[PDB]
């Protein structure tokens, strides 16, 4: 094919977040060249002599519009040099696999078209993902280079002929005209690096007897019309057994049939209906693109993602990998729960606390420095990639429920028992008016600062609250040097109970305040209540000393998780 230059003319919005470039389908399809620029944007960081050798992996989850940008993709990487680019079969790849094929074959990066756990289809998201060598998220200098480039742009080259079968395993050749080395597409299948690299984290053998046996544990999977659709009935059904309807929703449709493939109990309520009924021993939820997960046990019971991470903290040596890797570190978000801290702290492993992201992780990982990670909003990872792992959680679950024969249930009562119980909820307060939300933060704050504020006493029926610590929490990362201040208030009682807020949305019309409530409970009379009656008198001072219905008229949050 002939290679094409295009002038063009920039647009001053394209800049990449942390999840990369999300904005709604139809402005990437009617918006004459927003995606080319971006595309070409994102390839004119690489050196233009280092990309004749290089691959790039690209992949996405399903979604609306992802097969269309995926030969866009192709068209600017064969007229810019790329020399190959790894596509999954169809275009499907989890963030999860692409995060593997890119360390596993040395990949300079690869781009990812998902918008996460957000809707797809017509009206939905379209996003469109960095990820460099290390098979992580890029960094703010790279997107950052990316942002300038797409605002200053002026030209992009395009092979507007050549076109790619998606569905087709194996290689493609092009010739470029008068260009002296043809561009290569390899086509591969979605799930076969994936799960071999599985296949030596965990135990398959008895992975294969907990779910086929005579005596097998019953699982109910459902992927939610997303990406993990095919990497579920490959592995859990087909390699390790469990019978086919064990995996539900597991075809990727292209607006994840009408529904957002978001891990929770609300948005996945089918499935919890399912486990209502007492069948199964353990269910599980996806998002998207297979980064997050939700793990229920038998009759529903919700097992929340902060004790989640300490569980299989606790019970990591149950799993191949970590005994062959040793422990390297523990590691939680901010606004995260303790639960993984009182593991840490029990074992002697060092625990880091950071700001949220994955960035912060990636850091740690790279410098051998940590082995497990988690966060309270559904997700959980470990070193063996650079992305969280939405499946791997929950083969690292069905790996300690073969180990230790007890239930999930009864695992988290033995587990709260030995450690005490986090009780943890997050509050969502969600189209909150800007000016309200950001005086109320900046009022408590200025509170908190007082030289008075610790040593403060709180209570609100039992127990007394005895403020330690207050600050605005900062991170100053050990790895790439970074600051990041104004991550969240927090007040940290010596008790180890912790109220935490955060204005997440902090400006457009509308503001985001969630509120994390962490209430500590060793007493073993009280570890097995419901979180909602045992965090009320914790949750009354911190809307009181906060002043947030005065601040924002709200006199309850948007959404409990
Ligand atoms: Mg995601």
Redo the contacts with the bound molecule.
């Keep these: 094919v002939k290679i094409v230059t295009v002038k063009t003319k920039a647009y001053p919005d394209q800049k990449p977040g942390t999840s990369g470039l999300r904005k709604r389908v139809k402005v990437f399809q009617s918006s004459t060249n927003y995606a080319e620029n971006f595309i070409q944007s994102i390839i004119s960081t690489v050196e233009p002599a280092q990309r004749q050798e290089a691959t790039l992996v690209v992949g996405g989850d399903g979604r609306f519009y992802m097969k269309e940008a995926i030969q866009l993709i192709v068209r600017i990487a064969a007229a810019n040099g790329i020399g190959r680019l790894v596509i999954g079969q169809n275009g499907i790849l989890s963030?999860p696999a692409v995060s593997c094929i890119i360390r596993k074959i040395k990949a300079i990066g690869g781009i990812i078209l998902?918008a996460?756990?957000n809707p797809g289809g017509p009206n939905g998201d379209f996003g469109i993902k960095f990820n460099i060598s290390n098979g992580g998220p890029a960094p703010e200098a790279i997107t950052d280079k990316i942002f300038q480039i797409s605002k200053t742009i002026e030209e992009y080259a395009i092979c507007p002929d050549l076109k790619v079968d998606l569905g087709v395993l194996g290689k493609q050749q092009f010739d470029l005209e008068n260009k002296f080395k043809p561009f290569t597409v390899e086509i591969v299948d979605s799930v076969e690096a994936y799960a071999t690299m599985l296949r030596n984290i965990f135990d398959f053998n008895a992975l294969k007897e907990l779910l086929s046996g005579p005596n097998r544990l019953k699982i109910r999977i459902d992927a939610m019309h997303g990406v993990v659709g095919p990497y579920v009935k490959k592995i859990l059904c087909e390699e390790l057994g469990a019978p086919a309807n064990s995996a539900v929703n597991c075809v990727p449709l292209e607006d994840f049939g009408g529904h957002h493939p978001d891990p929770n109990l609300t948005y996945a309520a089918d499935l919890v209906e399912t486990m209502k009924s007492g069948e199964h021993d353990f269910g599980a939820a996806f998002?998207?693109?297979?980064?997050?997960n939700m793990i229920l046990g038998k009759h529903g019971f919700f097992v929340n993602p902060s004790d989640s991470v300490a569980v299989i903290a606790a019970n990591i040596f149950s799993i191949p990998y970590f005994q062959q890797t040793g422990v390297r570190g523990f590691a939680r978000s901010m606004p995260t729960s303790g639960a993984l801290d009182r593991v840490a702290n029990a074992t002697k492993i060092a625990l880091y606390e950071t700001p949220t992201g994955w960035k912060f992780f990636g850091n740690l990982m790279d410098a051998s420095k940590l082995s497990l990670c988690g966060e309270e909003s559904f997700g959980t990872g470990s070193d063996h990639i650079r992305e969280k792992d939405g499946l791997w959680a929950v083969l690292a679950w069905l790996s300690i429920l073969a180990t230790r024969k007890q239930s999930v249930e009864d695992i988290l009562k033995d587990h709260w028992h030995k450690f005490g119980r986090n009780f943890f909820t997050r509050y969502d307060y969600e189209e909150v008016e800007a000016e309200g939300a950001t005086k109320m933060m900046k009022d408590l704050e200025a509170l908190m600062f007082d030289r008075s504020f610790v040593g403060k006493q709180f209570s609100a029926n039992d127990k007394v609250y005895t403020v330690e610590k207050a600050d605005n929490f900062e991170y100053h990362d050990p790895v790439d040097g970074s600051v990041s201040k104004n991550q969240g208030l927090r007040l940290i009682f010596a008790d180890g109970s912790r109220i935490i807020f955060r204005l997440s949305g902090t400006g457009s019309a509308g503001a985001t305040i969630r509120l994390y409530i962490d209430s500590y409970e060793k007493d073993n009379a009280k570890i097995n209540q419901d979180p909602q009656v045992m965090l009320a008198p914790l949750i009354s001072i911190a809307l009181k000393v906060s002043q947030l219905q005065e601040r924002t008229g709200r006199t309850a949050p948007t959404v409990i998780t």
């Design positions: 963030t998902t996460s756990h998002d998207g693109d297979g980064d997050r």
